[PDB]
Design a protein around this ligand. Structure first.
Ligand code: HEM
Ligand code: HEM
Ligand code: HEM
Ligand code: HEM
Lengths: 141, 142, 142, 141
């Protein structure tokens, strides 16, 4: 389970993310699209060129939802209920893809944090991102 | 297969890699983030905590050897399958490591490289390196 | 590779398989047990419920074709990689189906075969058939 | 989430399992060992020959725990807490293996139920076995 120490490590890193929600979100999305091109088929309506308005606007929305999750870590299901119905019932997102985006997010974090993205920090975010992923896919179970 | 550009993203970044540091990092992170992997290292001594793992000499030395092995893929990008055949038998028949863990170590290495080379580890670079660890994971699962 | 005994477990059981029935079962079960797979069948019409899926003519016909395809592996156990190369390009480049789903369909087929052939689907038979679906999943992930 | 209908479908099939806990448990374990030989390394102390006392005794224990889980489906974590600490802290069981055993259990069920192991029944057990697996591995998160 997420410990208090995990939460603190998460918050310390997150307040930085919040200062550039758009930049981080877009970078995580673009790494996913470039590294795992199959994920692009979920966004046919999007102009997927580097830094497109759609990607930037969406990146901020993703970061925004993750920020809300950080704020309500003990009440994820309820907090993401609307998003869970969306990704499962409407978008039919393959669970595997949540892991791909979570991973790309960690890469963005690692790149921006340098030596501050310690193993302890990675653990906390891994736990966090895995919990968020589980909720966004619970409608399949 | 590998495009000249991909090969460049791999060889140029690797020439700057501190194998011992990145190797120890990747292995310590594997044992810490996915604790069940500790099952395979009962002889390495104390692994009772994240700090214990990061200060475990054997864990660090081993990661060095693992990343050195990855180096053999970087140095012969077209014969990865043949290069790891021996290690494949070792991890399967002898160690019985589920293949899924090969993918997890690969992912960890990707993240470590990102924390060490933020400027050079662009999305395109990540794509080339992800292709690399995946190929090693595939060859080992053989 | 395949041992004469394994090949016998495969060919003998398959000669008794009702391709249309098992195929429809496997596909309907894929869409029902792992609903995100429905994403790839938007043109098949109503898939709004388990019952709707089991009565979907297109879903049934398609499963028949899928199991027929599996039949081509059974009929040429040593050239599976070559036999599915075309379908591999189709599911990847064209359909963009994550490879993990190939493994899930394989697992479903294993369970279906068990419900249809309890007497013959022994642990040893399951081992041979699991090797089969895995090889098809591997060839398609190519 | 597990619906009431899922629970009923599960119970109907389970009362049959309870009549031969030992037979079912052993069959599921042996299929795992034979189909996925790597899982055998977790049981070096066991005589793994067909129907060995150790396999039969263990199979019944596994079925027994699953039976308890069926009985307390709304309180899994607490009910399996002791088993979760065991599989994670003591045995270091790779999460992947819970999926392998869950799958082999479904094969045993399918074989014994025939046409009664409908897609609806499979869904219910898939949900159930996945939930039990998540709990037995939660100590890793
Ligand atoms: C870290 C896990 C994820 C979170 C927190 C998340 C969050 C969100 C949010 C909040 C929206 C709605 C934005 C709005 O209201 O405009 C959204 C939309 C969407 N998401 Fe995700 N998402 C995640 C993962 C994924 C994955 C893995 C995929 C598949 C590759 C995906 C595909 C989509 C699509 C197609 C939309 C529709 C957006 C549009 O049309 O603008 N998401 N997501
Ligand atoms: C897919 C990336 C991997 C590569 C390239 C790799 C490479 C190697 C190499 C070269 C050795 C021999 C050490 C020596 O030089 O003496 C080794 C040993 C070993 N590996 Fe890996 N390995 C990988 C992944 C894993 C994973 C995922 C596990 C399981 C958690 C694992 C468990 C082991 C164990 C237990 C040994 C024996 C070391 C000892 O007994 O001291 N490896 N590996
Ligand atoms: C690994 C086992 C699989 C085999 C052997 C297989 C085989 C085939 C074959 C032979 C076709 C061509 C149908 C025709 O005869 O016209 C096909 C089509 C297709 N498959 Fe698969 N397939 C497999 C798994 C999957 C999976 C896991 C998915 C994703 C859920 C998938 C999605 C599709 C789709 C969308 C089509 C196109 C059908 C249409 O547009 O009507 N397949 N497959
Ligand atoms: C359906 C999921 C599982 C359940 C409900 C379960 C349940 C149990 C229970 C209740 C015990 C203790 C028996 C006793 O008190 O004598 C046990 C022991 C054990 N389990 Fe599991 N288990 C599961 C999956 C696994 C998996 C996937 C593995 C790895 C292949 C595994 C390996 C072991 C081992 C090594 C023991 C020690 C037993 C002994 O030494 O007799 N289990 N399990």
């Amino acid at each position: 389970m997420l410990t208090e120490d995990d939460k603190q490590l998460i918050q310390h890193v997150w307040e930085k993310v919040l200062e550039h929600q758009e930049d981080f979100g877009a970078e995580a999305l673009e790494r996913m699209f470039i590294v795992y091109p199959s994920t692009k088929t979920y966004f046919p309506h999007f102009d997927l060129h580097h830094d497109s308005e759609q990607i930037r606007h969406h990146g901020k929305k993703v970061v925004g939802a993750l920020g809300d999750a950080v704020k309500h870590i003990d009440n994820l299901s309820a907090t993401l209920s609307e998003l869970s119905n969306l990704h499962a019932y409407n978008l039919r997102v393959d669970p595997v893809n949540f892991k791909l985006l979570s991973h790309c997010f960690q890469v963005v974090l690692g790149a921006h944090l340098g030596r501050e993205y310690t193993p302890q920090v990675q653990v906390a975010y891994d736990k966090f991102l895995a919990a968020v992923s589980a909720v966004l896919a619970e409608k399949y179970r | 297969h590998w495009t000249s550009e991909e090969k460049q993203y791999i060889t140029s970044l690797w020439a700057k890699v501190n194998v011992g540091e990145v190797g120890g990092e990747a292995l310590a992170r594997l044992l810490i983030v996915y604790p069940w992997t500790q099952r395979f290292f009962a002889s390495f001594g104390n692994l009772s905590s994240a700090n214990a793992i990061l200060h475990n000499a054997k864990v660090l030395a081993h990661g060095q050897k693992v990343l050195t092995s990855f180096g053999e893929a970087v140095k012969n990008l077209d014969n990865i399958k043949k290069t790891f055949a021996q290690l494949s038998e070792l991890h399967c028949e002898k160690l019985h490591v589920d293949p899924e863990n090969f993918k997890l170590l690969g992912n960890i290495l990707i993240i470590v490289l990102a924390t060490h080379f933020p400027k050079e580890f662009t999305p395109a670079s990540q794509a080339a390196w992800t292709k690399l660890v995946n190929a090693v994971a595939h060859a080992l699962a053989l």
